[PDB]
Every structure is written in structure tokens, then in C-alpha cells.
Amino acid sequence: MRAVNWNKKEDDFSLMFWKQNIAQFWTEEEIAVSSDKNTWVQLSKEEQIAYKRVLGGLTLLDTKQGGEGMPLVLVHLENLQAKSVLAFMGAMEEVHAKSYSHIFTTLATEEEIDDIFDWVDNHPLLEKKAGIITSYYRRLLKPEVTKKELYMAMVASVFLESYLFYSGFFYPLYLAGQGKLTASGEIINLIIRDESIHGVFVGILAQQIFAELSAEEQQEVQKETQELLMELYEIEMAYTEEIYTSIGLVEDVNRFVRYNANKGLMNLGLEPKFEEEEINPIVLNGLRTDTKNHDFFSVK
Ligand SMILES: [Fe+2]
Numbered sequence: 001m002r003a004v005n006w007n008k009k010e011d012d013f014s015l016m017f018w019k020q021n022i023a024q025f026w027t028e029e030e031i032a033v034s035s036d037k038n039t040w041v042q043l044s045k046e047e048q049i050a051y052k053r054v055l056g057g058l059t060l061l062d063t064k065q066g067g068e069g070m071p072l073v074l075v076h077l078e079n080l081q082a083k084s085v086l087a088f089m090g091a092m093e094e095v096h097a098k099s100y101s102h103i104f105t106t107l108a109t110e111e112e113i114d115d116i117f118d119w120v121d122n123h124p125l126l127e128k129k130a131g132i133i134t135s136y137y138r139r140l141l142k143p144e145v146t147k148k149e150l151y152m153a154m155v156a157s158v159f160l161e162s163y164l165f166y167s168g169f170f171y172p173l174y175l176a177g178q179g180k181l182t183a184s185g186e187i188i189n190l191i192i193r194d195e196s197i198h199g200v201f202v203g204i205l206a207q208q209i210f211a212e213l214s215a216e217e218q219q220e221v222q223k224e225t226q227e228l229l230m231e232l233y234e235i236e237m238a239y240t241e242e243i244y245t246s247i248g249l250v251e252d253v254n255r256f257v258r259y260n261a262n263k264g265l266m267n268l269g270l271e272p273k274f275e276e277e278e279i280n281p282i283v284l285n286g287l288r289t290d291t292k293n294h295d296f297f298s299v300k
Contacts, residue, residue, distance in 0.1 A: 004080040011208075014081035017201050021088050024197075026190050026292065027095055028102035031183055039180040040107055046246045051175070052108060053243055054168035056120035058191075059100045061165060064130055064137075066093025069157050072140040073202075076150060082205060089198050096191045103184045125242070129235050132228070133160050147209055148217050154206035155225050155268065159232060162199035162264035163257075165192075167236050167243070170253045170283065177286030185290040192287070196263075203267030210269070229261065229273060252280050 009015065043051070070090030077083045104113050120126060136156035139149055169192060176185025213221060236257050244250040258274035265273055 010079045010081040028099040033106045033183040036181045036183045052116045054171045056116040058168045062093045062097035066090045068137045072137040151209045163261045166260035170256045173283040173286035176290035177282040199267045207269045
């Protein structure tokens with residue numbers, strides 16, 4: 001049947017995204033994380049635990065996005081060029097998942113790693129948020145899907161990649177911005193840089209499909225989008241509360257969540273939901289300065 005033909009455009013953006021995606025490729029081997037021990041051992045129990053929790057949580061999300069979300073969305077696309085980009089995004093999800101193990105391996109012992117994975121696995125909130133997302137992917141497990149079903153699986157993917165990670169990314173950024181666990185912060189920054197072009201791109205794909213829904217499908221899809229947002233917001237607020245009260249950050253993580261929920265919506269070409277809140281200046285600093293870009297030996 002059809003072979004991908006990159007010499008003839010299937011759309012106006014897949015090639016630019018393909019090139020951006022591959023230009024960003026990295027792998028954990030390029031970031032030694034061992035000198036982070038020095039700041040790791042200065043943190044308290046409650047801070048350690050919290051950092052382990054949010055990383056286990058991020059791992060679950062990359063586990064799902066790379067093992068079901070991208071495979072199940074891409075396989076029903078007719079655009080072979082967009083298909084190639086999603087396939088590559090899925091592999092990077094797995095590079096991301098595994099970098100968390102890379103970090104774990106310098107921070108915690110086996111037994112400690114075991115408990116994180118056990119806690120992640122048996123965690124009811126993670127099952128609920130991840131299940132909500134996943135049910136949209138598992139709906140595509142059949143030979144033919146509706147446009148509505150494909151749109152919605154893409155709504156769910158941009159919610160996961162632009163929004164649901166960020167209750168977790170908050171912590172390592174927060175510490176990096178203060179000089180703590182900065183090699184890991186670098187890894188977390190590369191993950192964000194991929195995640196955020198992942199979100200833009202599926203957002204674009206979602207918007208083309210939207211433009212082809214019947215006027216009233218468009219309504220059902222709007223309505224369902226909003227309820228999905230708020231049902232995840234509700235579970236993110238409980239998640240926040242249970243992760244971040246013991247170290248006093250809840251309301252700071254919350255503002256960061258709504259901030260990202262907004263970029264999520266915007267990626268879908270939708271109006272923002274929350275009023276413009278400023279982001280914690282110490283997370284701003286982790287994002288801006290704890291990057292692999294900044295990390296090199298000056299020749300001066
Ligand atoms: Fe990721």
C-alpha cells in the first residue's frame with residue numbers, strides 16, 4: 001500500500017517537528033548524576049520521600065504514554081509523516097522513563113527503589129489519573145475508530161504531556177533552582193523540553209481533526225474536554241495535597257499545575273482556564289539555568 005515519502009509533504013509541520021524531535025535526542029549516559037549525592041544527603045526524610053514519589057509518578061506516566069498512548073494513537077493515523085513523529089516521541093517517552101531509574105540508582109538503594117515502585121503501583125490516585133487517560137487510548141484498540149474517538153485520545157495525550165506531568169516536575173525544578181540535585185535537574189529539563197514539543201504537536205493534530213468534526217460533534221468534544229480537564233484537576237489537587245503538605249509546597253505546586261493546564265489547553269487551540277498566576281521564582285530559575293545547554297567546560 002502507501003510507503004512514507006518525505007520528499008512530498010503530507011502536511012505543513014511534520015518535517016519541522018521530526019527534525020526538532022531528533023535534534024533534541026539525548027540519553028541518560030550523557031549526564032552523570034553521582035555528585036548530586038552531596039545535596040541529596042542534606043535533604044530531610046520528608047524531602048527525599050517527596051522527591052522519590054513524584055519521580056515514581058512521572059515514570060508511570062512515561063510508561064503509559066510510550067507503551068499505549070503513542071502506539072494506539074499513531075496506528076490509526078493516515079498521515080505517515082505525522083505517524084513517524086509520534087513513533088519517535090514514544091521512543092523518547094521510554095528514554096524518559098528510564099532516565100528516572102538512572103537518577104534513582106544514585107539516590108536510593110535497591111530496597112528503597114523497590115518501595116518506590118511498590119508505592120507507585122499500589123497508589124490509588126495514580127491508578128485513577130492514569131486510568132482516566134488510558135481509557136481514551138484503550139478505546140482505539142479496534143480496527144476502525146471515529147474522528148471523535150481519535151480527537152479525544154489526542155485531548156487526553158496533550159493533557160498528560162502538557163499538564164499531568166507538572167505536579168511532579170515541580171519538585172526537581174524547585175530543588176535545582178536552589179543548587180540541589182542539579183544533575184538530575186538537567187535530566188528533568190531535557191524531559192520537559194521533549195514533553196513540551198510533544199504537547200504542541202499532538203495539539204496540532206487534534207486541531208486538524210477538530211476542523212472535520214460535525215458542528216455538534218464539536219460541542220460534545222468541547223463539553224467532554226472541559227469535564228476531562230476538571231476531573232483531572234480535582235485528582236491533581238488531591239495529589240498535590242497528599243504529596244506536598246509535609247514539606248509546605250501545596251499551593252505553590254497548585255499554581256504551577258494550573259499554569260501548565262493552561263499551556264495544555266492552549267496547545268489544543270483552547271482558551272485558558274485559570275487566571276494568570278506567576279510561577280514560583282525558584283522553579284523559574286531551575287528551568288532557565290539548570291539546563292544541559294549551560295553545562296560544559298569553558299575554553300576560556
Ligand atoms: Fe516524557
